[PDB]
């Protein structure tokens, strides 16, 4: 429900997907990849009120919690619900070759 | 059971989908150019004409640095057979005119929408050997901003636009892939199998063990295992229990597809478990996660007779696959 | 570590570095070798035509142009002259990952 | 491996599942449940590190973006996983009525 | 949003001569239909103090008597007279607005 679509469409500060750069060399050391150099692994990040994309019913009481304590420091928290692999091309010996790193790009987000 | 050699009859096959390009080369040069050149040259093999598929399906996409692509391209689709090339667009300005140069006696089925409207296609003599081809486009279009030479595939994923990393100038090389211009290839690879004699029952046990999902080294890092489930034939429907067991010691992402069959699904993996799109799921897929599954013929049978995943209906071992199929008769 | 080694693995190529101290491969291939046993090998050949640069993962205990290995646990890829007649020749070896893609000729500034 | 036993045998400063007691008109306003008035709805809270229990390939190329770069904001949230149902029982007119809330208490916890 | 009610059958207290009391109900229900409100009965006599609190639909009458105040959203104890005991109704259409009775609003 709250696809990269919706959150890059309009920004909004609840618990939605947010643009990030994973840069293979750079950040995650992996030194075996020759392309892409860097990728976009979008995080999930925002608060989860009650009135919204809540999946599961320990969730939603989870969020009653919270809204009727504040002061408790638990709270659902915003995590990928659908994520797309990433292709990439590495050298065995001299060939290059084509791999499919799955659950690599997060597509949505939910609240749980 | 006994473990042989499977054939069509074995309810999973064990394809293997892997991208490859013969040769190519992708060269930055045609920045300064009006127009992009995309070559491509098909290769055949010596099997009957009439076996060989006479459809392609070029997709088109911009790279992963362009949201969408507003540049006139000029696409030079050769191939030493008569082909029928059923484009897919995706992500692409609407209005720019594009050409496609495609091989005598080709034909171009541009999809719906304002890309077939300006759109020209002109069918040419293109030479049947890489380096004419290349100096062909070279001489008619300054440099080519990607050249790939590869064997007729069913899929033909595309990129288009400047990569600045690329080279200046084309030079092609055998060992030469890049994630933009590649082709889709299902090799069919040989596995072990077995099927328990059983009467027709609503519920079924398929096991697959899968020995090594990719051959680099490098098996810290999780494959997509695309598992097809689709019947003989899609119609009459079949609706059915279906109880998945996959084992893979090395870590993998089991991804379940269903099309055309309706019906309870479960799926039981020491690794992840996924699901195709809305489109891909036609049962009720539930997932179920035990990192207890043994890693041997033998014992995946106690280990379904324990926990009652029975009877169990097939086995299939694959030494080395990432694409299975699952043919489900009536 | 068990895992394999990781090396540039362009072929022969012209490079522009010559007789300097210190250089970059500048091969923009970082290659996972085929067997585990294998280790980074940079080949600098230097003619009064053309110079060039050549990098592989070769096995240490196979002699690569003849020449054997005798620096396969060098952490980094110490180049050494060898006695290749007419051209001039210098290998060197090393086991780090990407390791040739560095090449000293010598440590002194 | 993160279950009730292993993070109430002792304190685990990351990713744990914690003893929460969830009391219904208290803490929800679900005055319509008559037994029980109470019950043990743990939540999963712990800052996720790289060498932990990381359930997908997307967490951990996160957790390794976060181990090399600290001020990122972005990491896994420790999320639930294994869930259990609660068992209630509540009157309709003069009618009770048993019935186990499905998803309701937390038993392990995972990182997403 | 179906209405919550106490739905205690006749018990015995101490609410007598007082401003307000507590229906001292342990059973919180929905009732059968939400168009269903919350009834409060209060039945004194020598015998001893005898109080009710249920659901009814607020058209319908409870032992022939017509609640005419179901319409109100508190439960009010109005006076009803009946033989051998006095009669004491109220009627509330919100959630759980039976568990306390209030007799006046006076203070």
Redesign the interface.
Known sequence: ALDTNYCFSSTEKNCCVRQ?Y?DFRK???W??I????G???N?C?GPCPYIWSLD???SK??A??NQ??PGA??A?????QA?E?L????????????????????RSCKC? | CELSPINASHPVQALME???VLSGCASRGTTGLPREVHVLNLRSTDQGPGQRQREVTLHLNPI?SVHTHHKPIVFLLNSPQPLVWHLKTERLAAGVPRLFLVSEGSVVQFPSGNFSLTAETEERNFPQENEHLLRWAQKEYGAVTSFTELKIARNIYIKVGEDQ?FPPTCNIGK?????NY?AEYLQPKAAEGCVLPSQPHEKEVHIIELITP?????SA????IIVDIRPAQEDPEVVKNLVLILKCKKS??W?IKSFDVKGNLKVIAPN?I?FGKESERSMTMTKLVRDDIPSTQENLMKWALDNGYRPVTSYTMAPVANRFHLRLEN | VKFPQ?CK?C?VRFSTCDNQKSCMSNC???????KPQEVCVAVWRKNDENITLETV?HDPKLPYHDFILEDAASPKCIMKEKKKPGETFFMCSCSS??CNDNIIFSEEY
């Not at chain 1, 292709?87 to 997060?106: A, F, H, T, W």
């Not at chain 3, 923009?28 to 085929?34: D, K, L, Q």
């Open positions: 990030l994973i950040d995650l050391g030194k075996w020759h392309e892409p150099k990728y976009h692994a995080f990040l599961t019913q320990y009481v989870l009653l919690y009727h304590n420091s638990a659902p928290c915003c995590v990928p994520l692999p292709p990439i091309v590495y050298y065995v010996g001299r060939k290059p070759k084509v791999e499919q790193l799955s659950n690599m790009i997060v749980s | 892997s991208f490859t992963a990393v060992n030469f892939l890049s994630l590649l990719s051959s680099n080294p490098y890092f999780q494959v997509d993998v992402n991804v992840s996924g | 990781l693995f072929d923009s291939i970082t290659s996972i070798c085929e993962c990952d990407e």
